Amino acid sequence: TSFKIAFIQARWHADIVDEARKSFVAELAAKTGGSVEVEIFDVPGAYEIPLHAKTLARTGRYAAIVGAAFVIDGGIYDHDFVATAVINGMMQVQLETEVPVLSVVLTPHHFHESKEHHDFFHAHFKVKGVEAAHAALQIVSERSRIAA
Amino acid sequence: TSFKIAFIQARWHADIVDEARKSFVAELAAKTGGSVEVEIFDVPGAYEIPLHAKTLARTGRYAAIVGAAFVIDGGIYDHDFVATAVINGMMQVQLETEVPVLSVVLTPHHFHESKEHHDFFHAHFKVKGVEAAHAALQIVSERSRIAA
Amino acid sequence: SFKIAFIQARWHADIVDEARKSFVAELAAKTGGSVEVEIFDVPGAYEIPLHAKTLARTGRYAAIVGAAFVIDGGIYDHDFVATAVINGMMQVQLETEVPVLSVVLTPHHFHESKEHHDFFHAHFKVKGVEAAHAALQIVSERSRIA
Amino acid sequence: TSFKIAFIQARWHADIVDEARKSFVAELAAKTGGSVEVEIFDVPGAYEIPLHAKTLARTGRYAAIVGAAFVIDGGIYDHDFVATAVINGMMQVQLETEVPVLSVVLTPHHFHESKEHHDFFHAHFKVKGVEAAHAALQIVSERSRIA
Amino acid sequence: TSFKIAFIQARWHADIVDEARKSFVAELAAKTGGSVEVEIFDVPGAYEIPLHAKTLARTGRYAAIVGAAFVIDGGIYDHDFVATAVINGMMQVQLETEVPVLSVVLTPHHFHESKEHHDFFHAHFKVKGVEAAHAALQIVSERSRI
């Protein structure tokens, strides 16, 4: 099984999001040896992920795309508007291009800084990165059956 | 009569989602004898369901598709964004392909683990599986009356 | 002289029925019978948008009505469906250009008993009459600006 | 500085919505003399506004469309679903037909009747009607400059 | 590199929004010398931003578009409906025209006037303006690579 995966990661709070990418790339290598290679693409924020996924999806080069970002909802500013536009936009792109788009765009409830939490979120994203790899593998596999 | 149904089930919490598939298949068999056959498709999570339904729908092979997942909203992480993208997504796929997509993608309010609840949710999903079979049958039948 | 497709969900049929009954009657009173209504049953609210689109695509109807009772509240979040449906109906009408009227009602968190049951039956009877006046009015208004 | 505007007003609570239309038409008259004429169209409720706007927009006759309605959210019944379909629907229509659609579809938080409030809302809508006219003029003008 | 950016600012509360445009233009000049020029467009409210973005995007002239508005959610009137149509609308536009659209459409939680807050919001918008500039540059660059 040989295919490429585009992983789009937002850079706001890159220290957290990076945990997921590292985790994701690792597991993928463990589980496939290296016959599945992952190309990384940086993007300013979550809001730039959908158009980037659509562009990349359109190239025909990837079997799946992952968009990861940490969207901290809460503070003086309402941020859920963005999270909604982004998760919905990703759904829209995959329905339109027919390339699976997996989401590692996490939105905590109203977390609130400190080595207390910082370690919580770093742990959590490491986990979600592993899960993401398992899903990516599984959905690619499953689609190539379902269409044969 | 005779036609096929694709049943897409998400694997996160499979132990609960399974109850719905079992019950759905069963009732379908009882009520039709066997003239309506159900093909099962696995998928990592809820978010993977819309594109899978669109791909399966576009094959012409099914009179109806059922998407079933358990989306536990609540915890440190906001999970409603995904439930929304998925329930809206399924709606969008059926409108675009014109193959009915029924939902058994359930989102409890903020359930909280323990043989207490676990039996509640296993029960509820078994029921929703039966209702879903009656719904599937009734909608396919009703559409073929309109249509012609 | 024209047809109206009335799509009614069957979950809680006892309540939705009030609306249809009411709708049909008023429609007969106000027009005589030159506007006929065809009824379509559907398992739940979620089945209404595709049904509306299919019917709207036939060219037979001047307007479609989707009626259902979507009880939001309980251990399960139900607003996701209410949302997909009301939005879906808007989407259908924008795409097909046949008016779709909504009698898809979502109470706040009603809670059973002859107390409420009579409340909701009354309310749906009213909404059904309003719905008929609306259907007549919009069909009429569109044929002018058309 | 001479064009037409379609004003779509919902009739539920017409007593309130009407304030907005009156005010809108007046200000438009004052600020333009009369070279900008407004055609009014009635519609049952807010839910009927997007398809009407699409139809009217697609005629080519109007430089802008205004949908106005009062959507009372709150009571035993959840009403926000409709407000969302409508405000989103108007956005969709303008994106698709490229004729500006301005919103005077107002949703108070959970107002609660009485000469107390009735005068509040009548006032507010008269205000939003004026603002709407300024907006209308400004956006039509701005578009004809840039593309 | 050398390309143009359309900056669409809403005029309601212009005193605050302006802070962001000022800041955005500056940082862009600082960081690029002047090889990247910004064209400003005024619009009544936030709700007028997506169509404007779409029209400007369709001209071919711009590498990116920025929409900036202050949407004060809260008061007797629900305002989130608009915020939602606008941010979703901008996302839609960029998906359809494929010209990046950046958002500086901010909605505070329920701020409440006074030199106390006024300076808070003016400060915050100045900051988001700088960030927007860095984002604009970065996404234009990154797209021309892929």
UniProtKB/Swiss-Prot annotation, chains A, B:
Q: Which GO terms describe its biological process?
A: riboflavin biosynthetic process
Instruction: Write down the InterPro entries for this protein, in alphabetical order.
Output: LS, LS/RS, LS/RS_sf
> According to its UniProt record, where is this protein located?
Cytoplasm
Q: What is its biotechnological use? A: Could be useful as a specific antigen for the serological diagnosis of active infection of both human and bovine brucellosis. Has been used as a protein carrier of foreign peptides and proteins. The described characteristics of BLS make this protein an ideal antigen carrier for vaccine development.
Kindly list the positions annotated as binding (2S)-2-hydroxy-3-oxobutyl phosphate. 117
What up-regulates or down-regulates this gene? Answer: The two ribH genes may be differentially expressed during the Brucella infection cycle. Brucella would use RibH1 for flavin biosynthesis during the extracellular phase and RibH2 during intracellular growth.
Catalyzes what? (2S)-2-hydroxy-3-oxobutyl phosphate + 5-amino-6-(D-ribitylamino)uracil = 6,7-dimethyl-8-(1-D-ribityl)lumazine + phosphate + 2 H2O + H(+)
Q: Which residues form the active site?
A: 78
Q: Does the keyword Nucleus apply?
A: no
Which pathway does it serve?
A: Cofactor biosynthesis; riboflavin biosynthesis; riboflavin from 2-hydroxy-3-oxobutyl phosphate and 5-amino-6-(D-ribitylamino)uracil: step 1/2
Single GO cellular component term: cytosol
Question: Which residues are listed for 5-amino-6-(D-ribitylamino)uracil binding in this entry?
Answer: 12, 46-48, 70-72, 103
Q: Which GO terms describe its molecular function?
A: 6,7-dimethyl-8-ribityllumazine synthase activity
Q: Which UniProt keywords apply?
A: Cytoplasm, Riboflavin biosynthesis, Transferase
Q: What EC number(s) does the entry state?
A: 2.5.1.78
Q: How does it assemble?
A: Homodecamer, arranged as a dimer of pentamers.
Q: Which protein, by its recorded name, is this? A: 6,7-dimethyl-8-ribityllumazine synthase 2
Task: Give the gene that encodes this protein.
Answer: ribH2
